[PDB]
Symmetry: D2
Subunit: 123 residues, 4 copies
Amino acid sequence: KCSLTGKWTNDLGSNMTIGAVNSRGEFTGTYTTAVTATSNEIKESPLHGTENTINKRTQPTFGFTVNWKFSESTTVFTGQCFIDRNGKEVLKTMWLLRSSVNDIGDDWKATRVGINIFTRLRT
Amino acid sequence: RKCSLTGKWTNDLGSNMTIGAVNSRGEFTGTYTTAVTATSNEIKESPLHGTENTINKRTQPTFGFTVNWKFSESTTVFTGQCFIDRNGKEVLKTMWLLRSSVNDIGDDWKATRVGINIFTRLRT
Amino acid sequence: RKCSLTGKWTNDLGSNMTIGAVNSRGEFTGTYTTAVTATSNEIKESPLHGTENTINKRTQPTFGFTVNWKFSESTTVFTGQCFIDRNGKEVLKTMWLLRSSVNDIGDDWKATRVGINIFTRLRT
Amino acid sequence: KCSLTGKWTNDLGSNMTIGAVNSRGEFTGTYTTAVTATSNEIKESPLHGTENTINKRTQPTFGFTVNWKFSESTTVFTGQCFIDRNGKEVLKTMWLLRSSVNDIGDDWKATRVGINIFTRLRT
Ligand SMILES: O=C(O)CCCC[C@@H]1SC[C@@H]2NC(=O)N[C@@H]21
Ligand SMILES: O=C(O)CCCC[C@@H]1SC[C@@H]2NC(=O)N[C@@H]21
Ligand SMILES: O=C(O)CCCC[C@@H]1SC[C@@H]2NC(=O)N[C@@H]21
Ligand SMILES: O=C(O)CCCC[C@@H]1SC[C@@H]2NC(=O)N[C@@H]21
Ligand SMILES: *[C@@H]1O[C@H](CO)[C@@H](O)[C@H](O)[C@H]1NC(C)=O
Ligand SMILES: *[C@@H]1O[C@H](CO)[C@@H](O)[C@H](O)[C@H]1NC(C)=O
């Protein structure tokens, strides 16, 4: 039931747009982040993921990657699409954000972690 | 010099991956062979797809990828960086999140397991 | 103005904590009442002990604390910051790691679950 | 078997010293980190934790907090003490590091995550 294809929003204000998913579970899309950790003018980036098909679960598991266009940075999201009591969709995700570093000896700090909630937009 | 994602890699738990191209866009897919599971099902090669960052031609770009487990309801996401070590050997330093499937959203809080991984080239 | 850890807090899952002093050192202990479990055992108030940072008198210091689950083999660690919101209400923004017990070190990779939590004062 | 009381070292080079643990599972100690994320002269800080007693497990679960003396920063560790095949002790931990921020609206990036391995020192 829960479908990833469409236009979602975050508790941070981000805007993601996913296209349709396949047979292979794959989808594509674009992210418009509203916050950055990088001091660079934010720009609409592409996200590539995949959705789980293992059994027609009305509430699949998903993950996707964001290739930031404005940072040497990479973000990954994983989560599950849930069907509320309101009858409403809900991505409950969690993400890891890697920062680019110049030494294997500094990598240990290269990574942050958090959540995000996505919902849908009207119209 | 050149840290390409492309190639065959193994990893600290025994797991093994195989990654292909990398478009002019960093996009790339491959397969995954875990060596271990949180679940109870026989392992099956699973497909992977990711993107390599290229926003200031760096010789050790970051990357990320999803793994669509074939034998399971859940999914894992990996993010790291392609380091060129001192030995001159490439070394993927990585980290993931394994998202398990839960029946009830009020049970979400527990579906997320976190970990590391270090990949090293297989290829002789 | 003043974000003290001291007081009674509840949290987004229903869980509830009670924290006491805060020495001249930030050290402090209290109890914990989870509302939910990864395990199968009846819940029992568990003890907690932490430390509040005070290295440049900030009005919203960071903190951390461990929870020594009484009904279980495992442990959870919380770290966050004591925000003074705009409503003027304190708000603990937090995050944890729940370390489960495993029998075999080769099974370590899966013992770590990660999550959030937001605490809000109970006290009327 | 696995005992936390003593002097350990990391894969980063850090030095921690824990005292004895109680009956309540509690211990104390001091951390000497060898890397920082903060640009401040590093200084030996105090760590307060607790160890799990729930059944005499020769391989308990532990967690402790580090009140950094040189940063507005807090670190938390959790892990398990393991008894190797070599007969040797091994803390396999994982930590979360909170950075101090000035706005609830920037908190989302306030947190990094990683590992650490501790072993023992000789002498
Ligand atoms: O700092 C960078 O290099 C790019 C940051 C991208 C924004 C991150 S993605 C995780 C979190 N969720 C969002 O929507 N934005 C921040
Ligand atoms: O147990 C499942 O739900 C399928 C997971 C398959 C492997 C996970 S991905 C994180 C960790 N590292 C590996 O190489 N494999 C495990
Ligand atoms: O299931 C166990 O092993 C005991 C865990 C008790 C509660 C965990 S701590 C993280 C999460 N947030 C809560 O308030 N409780 C759970
Ligand atoms: O940057 C700060 O504010 C203090 C950093 C303390 C060092 C951290 S603790 C996690 C990781 N492990 C270590 O031993 N050091 C880094
Ligand atoms: C997303 O778009 C909505 C309206 O379509 C807007 O109000 C919000 O500010 C946008 N946030 C972005 C661009 O991430
Ligand atoms: C820890 O001490 C050892 C020797 O006791 C030393 O070689 C190492 O550099 C130290 N690291 C620190 C001070 O964190």
